Design a protein around this nucleic acid. Sequence first.
DNA 1: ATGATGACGCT
DNA 2: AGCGTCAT
Length: 421
Amino acid sequence: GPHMATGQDRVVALVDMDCFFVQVEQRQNPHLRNKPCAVVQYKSWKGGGIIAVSYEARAFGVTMSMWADDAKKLCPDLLLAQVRESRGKANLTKYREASVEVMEIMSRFAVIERASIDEAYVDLTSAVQERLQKLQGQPISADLLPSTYIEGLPQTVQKEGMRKQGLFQWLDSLQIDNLTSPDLQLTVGAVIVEEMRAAIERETGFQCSAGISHNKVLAKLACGLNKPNRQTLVSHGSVPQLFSQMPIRKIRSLGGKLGASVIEILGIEYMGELTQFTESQLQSHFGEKNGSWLYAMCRGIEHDPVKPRQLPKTIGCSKNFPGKTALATREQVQWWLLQLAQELEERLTKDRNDNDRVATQLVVSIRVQLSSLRRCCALTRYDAHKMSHDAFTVIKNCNTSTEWSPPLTMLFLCATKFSAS
DNA sequence: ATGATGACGCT
DNA sequence: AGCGTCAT
Ligand SMILES: Nc1ncnc2c1ncn2[C@H]1C[C@H](O)[C@@H](COP(=O)(O)OP(=O)(O)OP(=O)(O)O)O1
Ligand SMILES: [Ca+2]
Ligand SMILES: [Ca+2]
């Protein structure tokens, strides 16, 4: 249980653009539409590195991080679009601007948290309440959920047939008389997300997938279950079966070292197996915060808020200088810091005009033959020569010595600490 | 020769 | 403040 919290207090969605950079290039160049294609950056080394892959190309085994020359061995008719290059480096402006298109549409429906260039969390709890009162007590037609999967259902032999059967079982057992039913609330959430996804596609051309659940972690997991161009509802009730065979690494934030340590120390494989440990046990192995989080998460419960944040908190530029291209002379170091600073100035000035804010700190980070060393200085003027000069100053004293030893394999300039303006 | 980003936690 | 983790 009577006092046992069930993590069913919110409706949260995660919207994720399908193969996003590919869709941006396909909208622009119709010749690429409905074809195996990929987006690459740079071209000289092994045809360039693939950074996005259409679903038609994925069927050939083409993946992210693949060299284009290698992808071509799997998929000889693979089509390619390449990232713009400016000032000697990859320039991602086209994709950031396409991102803004989508985020602005989503923000018409609800408060969003920008999670990445192509993902946003959506807190739908309020929107759902409103739609529930407007719908009187009327049942929800399957026609309102034309691209929705209900995870765990059903419980003919074609994929769409399965989808509908599952949706039918779900709707035919919904308690539409109870405006406080979590399952009803999720369902209405899914209706709204259908509407949001239709509006994005109508107004931009871009397709996306989505997950609808009671928190961000379940929403994100949900989103990945049926892709592309589909959405998945994960109810509280679906969690025990879903987690019983769900590898721990699939849950957001457990994909790395912590997740590996959970597996090794507890000697388990699946998210569900976490339930047999006390909260104190989990905290003993993984710390107070992680332990509490795991104990609740493996039961489908998570409280991280959808933060009201549509804009990035930092604006950064970086370039790697791998192998022999590593920077070995002072003049080399200065010229690239300047290149980075010039892109940074451009993006910052745009940012200040669009969003009425100004960055106040400049963070400089380098690697010598992830980050070796980060140093910050004040950012008082949007001027690329001053920023590049300042960046040099705060890193110049780590030259072991043109000449620059040891060679620099990465330069990175990041503007941070925004104040309103 | 992945590269280019971006949020947040720890001390 | 500077570094590490985890992610797209
Ligand atoms: N490691 C990376 N380096 C550079 N760019 C990336 C990287 N990961 C993702 N991106 C860019 C390209 C993607 O189009 C976009 C969104 O990433 P992500 O959602 O992980 O894949 P995706 O949108 O291409 O495919 P999916 O349909 O699987 O989401 O961000
Ligand atoms: Ca995506
Ligand atoms: Ca994404």
